[PDB]
Amino acid sequence: TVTIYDVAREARVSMATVSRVVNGNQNVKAETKNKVNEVIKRLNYRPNAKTTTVGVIIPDISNIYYSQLARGLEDIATMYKYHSIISNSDNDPEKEKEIFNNLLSKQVDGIIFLGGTITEEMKELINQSSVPVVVSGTNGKDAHIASVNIDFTEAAKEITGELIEKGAKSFALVGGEHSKKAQEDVLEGLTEVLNKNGLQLGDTLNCSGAESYKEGVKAFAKMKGNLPDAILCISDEEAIGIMHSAMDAGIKVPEELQIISFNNTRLVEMVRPQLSSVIQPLYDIGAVGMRLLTKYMNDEKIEEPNVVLPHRIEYRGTTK
Amino acid sequence: TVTIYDVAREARVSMATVSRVVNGNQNVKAETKNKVNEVIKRLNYRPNAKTTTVGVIIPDISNIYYSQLARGLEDIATMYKYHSIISNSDNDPEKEKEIFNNLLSKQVDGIIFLGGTITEEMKELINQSSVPVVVSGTNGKDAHIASVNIDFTEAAKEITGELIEKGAKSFALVGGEHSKKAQEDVLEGLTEVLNKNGLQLGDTLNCSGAESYKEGVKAFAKMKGNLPDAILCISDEEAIGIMHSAMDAGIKVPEELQIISFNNTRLVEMVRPQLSSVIQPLYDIGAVGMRLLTKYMNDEKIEEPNVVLPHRIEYRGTTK
């Protein structure tokens, strides 16, 4: 299918600029607006279709990937003329239950979970409620809930193969407790390709709170001794922490060490070496989510309630 | 007064680690918890004191400074055992009115505005409502509303003096429409010190949406011809965009060009050259805010409802 990155790459603009054209920003240059509306019509990019309030539950609002996804959701909800309210759960099962029940008591019309884990108790509150629920990047007891994601397992198989071709033989995976679906699905793909070739998997570092730059400095500390050839990280901030820590300690990136991320954000280009990463269609993750949510809220049937969006891998500087 | 940075600098940890100790995170190392609780007691750091929901209105959730401030507010609100919900306004006066009225209809017990502008019409909705309101980094018709801020004008006078001592004679100021108080208060301080010494002020670049890295690439494009000696930027992401654009074009930072930010975030240390910036007590901005809000919600009088928090300036790499 067609994504915001396809329109952007073709039009030579950022996915953010495309989103501004789609959202009707009146400050976008009139000429670039035309250069974008042209690709949009040729590729036929169409992300979007009572007082209404959408509640969004994310583990960590300071997570740059999740705050981007959430702003996009808020842009899209204004297109639909919906109000929206965001709450911060820390993937704490008790906070999650308290949030859900708060949103229900405030009579939201739909809820979206970005990241985190649906406990079996949480699955009960969802099943028992009339408020429809769409999820993304969540794990746990989330079956038979409408969803949208990229295929992390496939992205990690693709990525792991390339590294082996470039000669990597030692591999490590770093992640955290906010993006657990990504960590698990990447480990699945990574270990399948490592086992295929009989290659070594090192420690799997799983941090407790924010998947931050400082958690990556501490992840580099934990492996400074027996560094692996390549490190796959879910958070791109965390990867930036491993990159800088290693380069400060003299390690050559990408010659001696290769780093790749999965949860892409604008930070990928704000750093030197630039970060090799999977590029997910962030705006479309929110567009599909609101489409799906809107159908439920309009008591319509949904043909395919579990959408898998395409991904791209831009190797750019932390890979050899 | 004492801030989170004072405890952190003394304990040799990050303000974030201190916040985790204060917030009762059970994953913080038991020894560091002691090293922090010691400074906390000596300096006597005490940031914090019906079902309750606090609504927070921010211009842009993807703004890293605002998302940090907002997570902190959410941590603090859990300490108080409050629910909280965040909404994204884009400093759009119509969105702001629609948000405010949405939060009131959902019967929130208090509202906090981070950044943005209080229009005269918005000031009416606030005056007419029984829901108390605290603001921070907002401008416009916000008089007689309780507030907490650092003194941007003073920070900009201090900073402008140092640059002149280091030989800067040409100065520019970049900002945007989300953080307008900061831009105006910094311009005030900057121009007062420039006029004192008869120094030149260049164009004041004011962007339309996110104060992002890409707006800084475009700000560098707009001045690539007649670059000034020093550029003051409100957003540290935007400053990172000017820094990388200039270094890619060969300009030496800090030798030929000096850059300084005002709205500090974790991004200051994730980049090389490291960003010279004003360090604001982010956790305390939210702690004072919730303290102030809580007093109103408990129908208590407030001795000093307009709090000015101390600031620090860490010159580190983009300054000579």
Could you say which DSSP state residue A48 is in?
Answer: -
Query: If contacts are CB pairs under 8 Å, which of residues 131-160 in chain A contact chain B?
Result: none
Cross-chain Cβ contact A86/B61 below 8 Å: yes
- With CB atoms and an 8 Å threshold, state whether A244 touches B272: yes
Mutate which: B23, B67, B271, vs A, most A CBs within 10 A:
B67
Q: How many CB atoms lie within 10 A of CB A251?
A: 16
Q: How far apart are CA A194 and CA B76, in angstroms?
A: 44
Chain A / chain B CB contacts < 8 angstroms: 123
Q: Which of residues 66-95 of B touch A (CB under 8 A)?
A: 67-68, 70-71, 74, 78, 83-88, 95
B23 to chain A, any CB pair closer than 8 A? The answer is: no
Residue A23 gets which letter from DSSP?
T
After which residues does chain A show a gap where C to N exceeds 2.5 Å? Answer: 49
Taking an 8 Å cut-off on Cβ atoms, the answer to whether A87 and B87 are in contact is: no
If residue A72 lies in a helix (H) or strand (E), which one and from where to where? helix A64-79
CA B319 to chain centre: 20
Neighbours of B301 (CB within 10 A): 7
Do the chains contact at A85 and B88, CB–CB below 8 Å?
no
Q: Experimental method used, please?
A: X-ray
d(CA B319, CA A255): 31
**Closest residue, chain A, to B244 (C-alpha):** A270
Q: How many Cα atoms within 13 Å fall on the side-chain side of residue A191?
A: 11
Pairing of strands B110-114, B83-88: unpaired
Q: Is A120 left (phi over 0), alpha (psi -120 to 50) or beta?
A: alpha
SS3 sequence of chain B:
CCCHHHHHHHHCCCHHHHHHHHCCCCCCCHHHHHHHHHHHHHCCCCCCCCCCEEEEEECCCCCHHHHHHHHHHHHHHHHCCCEEEEEECCCCHHHHHHHHHHHHHCCCCEEEEECCEECHHHHHHHHHCCCCEEEECCEECCCCCEEEECCHHHHHHHHHHHHHHCCCCEEEEEECCCCHHHHHHHHHHHHHHHHHHCCEEEEEEECCCCCCHHHHHHHHHHHCCCCCCEEEEEEHHHHHHHHHHHHHCCCCCCCCCEEEEEECCHHHCCCCCCCCEEECCHHHHHHHHHHHHHHHHCCCCCCCCEEECCCEEECCCCCC
| Residue A202, amino acid | G
φ, ψ of residue B175 in degrees (nearest 5): -160, -155
What was the resolution (in A) of this experimentally determined structure? 2.5
At a CB cut-off of 8 Å and minimum separation 6, what does B189 contact?
B152, B153, B154, B155, B156, B157, B160
Contact A317, A254 (CB under 8 A): yes
- In angstroms, the first-to-last Cα distance of chain A is 30
In A80-179, which residue ranges form alpha helices assigned H by DSSP?
Answer: 93-105, 120-128, 152-165
Chain B, window 175-204: residues with a beta carbon less than 8 angstroms from a chain A beta carbon: none
Three-class HEC string of B58-81: ECCCCCHHHHHHHHHHHHHHHHCC
